[PDB]
């Protein structure tokens, strides 16, 4: 047995929720007790620049955004089982870190 | 009338509020009546309130202001001239103290004096301008009951504000003198000079 | 103002010319019905279309309407 934490971060929620559900799915048919996923409060990375490359015109501003969504999943399983779950649910957008 | 024993003890005076809702738990709306048929529907005293602070939505529709309590409309007009905008608790304190001063003076019901000062302060005919693109022209027109009521509150608080400026007399007791004098129709009070001066000019335009 | 546009006015009257027997004078029933009759991309447009179809249905019962 091993208390293992899996942290999921990505910018887009569709691939994030697929990986999140897929990990939960593999922790269900395998009789592994789980806690999660925990939807962490999303982070809005905001950058407000001036539209004008020069300094002439009405003072108009862009407001760019970069939402970061974070999910943490707690697993009680041996380390070999949890790591192979990660390769099952590998997605280009979502990065995975595994901590005991 | 029975005194209700709670685990959290409740003061005697506030338990008396179960019988009746009174302004600041001191002033009753039951014996208050508007001595003018034309402003009954625009001076709202039928729904009693404890404190003149309701934080309601009276600016959404057109005539919702007529549904705001008359004392709350009065305390709203006190907080003016920049440094007082948004200071409603200060305004409520002034009104609460003003009513007590209006009570020790003339001994009447303080909110009755407030109602009397409002009916006597709204000009019944104001001379609107009909200037044709710059030239000076004035025409005498009638004044709606809503504008008649809310110009009384505007004039009553403006007069109280200026009487307390650079004066040792406090604003609460400048308002009490302003409200008491206008209630009895005395021309000494501000907002009665203004009301007379408005209706005097309107007489010279019809 | 609350003036409905042409994308909702003409699409709603196509429903009446096509599914009058299945329609009714109830918005809630119409709202569910138009979700199985038309492919609406957004819920807000679905409610607007069903809300105007109900108004037209309520008006047909009071007499003949022009254009439908």
């Amino acid at each position: 047995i091993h208390k293992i934490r899996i942290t999921l971060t990505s910018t887009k929620v569709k691939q994030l929720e697929n990986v999140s559900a897929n990990i939960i799915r593999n922790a269900a048919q395998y009789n592994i007790v789980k806690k999660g996923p925990v939807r962490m409060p999303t982070k809005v990375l905001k950058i407000t620049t001036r539209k004008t490359p020069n300094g002439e015109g009405s003072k108009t501003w862009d407001a760019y955004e970069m939402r970061i969504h974070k999910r943490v999943i707690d697993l009680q399983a041996p380390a070999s089982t949890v790591k192979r779950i990660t390769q099952i649910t590998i997605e280009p957008g979502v990065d995975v870190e595994v901590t005991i | 009338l029975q005194v209700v024993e709670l685990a959290t003890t409740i003061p005697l005076d506030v338990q008396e509020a179960q019988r009746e809702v009174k302004l600041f738990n001191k002033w009753s709306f039951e014996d208050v009546e508007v001595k003018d048929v034309s402003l009954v529907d625009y001076i709202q005293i039928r729904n009693p309130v404890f404190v003149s602070h309701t934080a309601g939505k009276y600016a959404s529709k057109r005539f919702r202001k007529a549904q705001c309590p008359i004392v709350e409309r009065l305390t709203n007009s006190l907080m003016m001239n920049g440094r007082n905008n948004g200071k409603k608790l200060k305004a409520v304190r002034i009104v609460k103290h003003a009513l007590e001063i209006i009570h020790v003076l003339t001994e009447q019901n303080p909110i009755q004096v407030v109602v009397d000062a409002i009916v006597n302060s709204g000009a019944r005919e104001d001379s609107t301008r009909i200037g044709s693109s710059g030239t000076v022209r004035r025409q005498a027109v009638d004044v709606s009951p809503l504008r008649r009521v809310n110009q009384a509150i505007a004039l009553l608080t403006i007069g109280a504000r200026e009487a307390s400026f650079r004066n040792i007399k406090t604003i609460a007791e400048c308002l009490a003198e302003e409200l008491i004098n206008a209630a009895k129709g005395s021309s000494t009070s501000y907002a009665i000079k203004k009301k007379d001066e408005l209706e005097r000019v309107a007489k010279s335009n019809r | 103002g609350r003036v409905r546009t042409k994308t909702v006015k003409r699409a709603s009257k196509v429903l009446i010319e096509r599914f009058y027997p299945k329609l009714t004078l109830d918005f809630e029933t119409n709202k569910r019905l138009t979700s199985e009759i038309a492919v609406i991309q957004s819920k807000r447009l679905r409610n607007k279309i069903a809300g105007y179809t109900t108004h037209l249905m309520k008006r047909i019962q009071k007499g003949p309407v022009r254009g439908i």
Partner: protein, 72 residues
């Protein structure tokens, strides 16, 4: 610069206060200043004692406003 309110209490004003303040419908800090020509600070101490001496009944208590009345 015309106020010149009295801030020191002599004997002529002291008994004048106790003979005149009771015959008032409403007394306060400004009322004492306005009509007795005494200063505001002297008015505040006069009110706090006149209440202790029983001449004056406290209608309402507040720091910024003191509403008082006759006790007779």
């Amino acid at each position: 610069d015309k106020a010149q309110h009295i801030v020191i209490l002599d004997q002529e004003k002291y008994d004048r206060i106790l003979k005149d303040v009771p015959t008032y419908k409403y007394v306060s800090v400004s009322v004492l200043v306005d009509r007795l020509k005494i200063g505001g600070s002297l008015a505040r101490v006069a009110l706090r004692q006149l209440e202790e001496d029983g001449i004056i009944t406290p209608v309402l208590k507040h720091s910024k406003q003191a509403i008082y009345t006759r006790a007779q």
